[PDB]
Amino acid sequence: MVNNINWVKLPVILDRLLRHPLLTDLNLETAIQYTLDFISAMGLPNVYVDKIETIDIKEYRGELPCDLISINQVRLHKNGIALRAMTDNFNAYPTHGEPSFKTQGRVIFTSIKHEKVDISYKAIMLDDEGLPLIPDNPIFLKTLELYIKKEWFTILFDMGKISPAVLNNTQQEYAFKAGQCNNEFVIPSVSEMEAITNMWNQLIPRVTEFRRGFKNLGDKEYIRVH
Amino acid sequence: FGSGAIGYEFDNRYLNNQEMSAVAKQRLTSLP
């Protein structure tokens, strides 16, 4: 992402929607739900807050933080060696290796019995209220506004209170801005294309960046003169 | 004289069939 994510409260999206006199029955409560549907459906990893927590595994199980949304990596605390993924069907089960993890709910399922693990994860940024906080990006803000205008107009079109030409314009305009908003958040900055440059140009290919926290991923590869 | 429970339901049904024709011309078009 080229621009920085400056945070603003959710009611800044309601100044923009209630400029439209057909969207004047909108609420904070409706703006809360349609934001989280929009934040999810875009899947932009720049909208989330990166956190790291150390949890302790009791017997192939550990309790996961409350704010966790997606795990970046799980690693061991004493080694720093990262855990990949549990493909075993019979993991902590005895009959009569490379460590792994698996997460379903608020429980993580590891391959190690009694160990502390660091979990680097993503959460949602909150307010003084326990409410979501959105980027002030006028591309993000415009297409979140067009998201809610397209969900409200879809209800109104089912009711028969909106022209099919009106909904077709809103469905088209949200469809353009959703790609512009995707490209706004995905396309790297100059400082991220340098780390992409160093990963791409490697005379001796570095193929074990998952073992670290992808720390040396964008590091530059140097060759001695001889 | 007067009684309008069959004049009403026939007029209400004619406006229904006229409304039904109007919603059958609605198209959400699918070119760019």
UniProtKB/Swiss-Prot annotation, chain A:
Protein name per the record: Ring protein 1
Additional free-text comment from the UniProt record: The barrel is composed of five stacked dodecameric ring structures. Podoviridae-like phages usually possess only one such ring. The tail is thus rather long.
Compartments where located: Virion
Entry keyword Protein transport: no
GO annotations of cellular component type: virus tail
Residues spanning the membrane: none
Record note on quaternary structure: Homododecamer.
Keyword annotations: Viral tail protein, Virion
Chief subcellular location: virion
Function: Forms the tail multi-ring barrel with ring protein 2, ring protein 3 and ring protein 4.
From Swiss-Prot, chain B:
Compartmental location: Virion; Host membrane
Organism name: Bacteroides phage crAss001 (Bacteroides phage PhiCrAss001)
Disulfide bonding pattern of the chain: none
Complex formation: Homododecamer. Interacts with the portal protein.
Function: Protein that is stored in high quantity in the viral capsid and may play a role during ejection.
UniProt name for this protein: Cargo protein 1
Signal peptide segment: none
Domain of life: Viruses
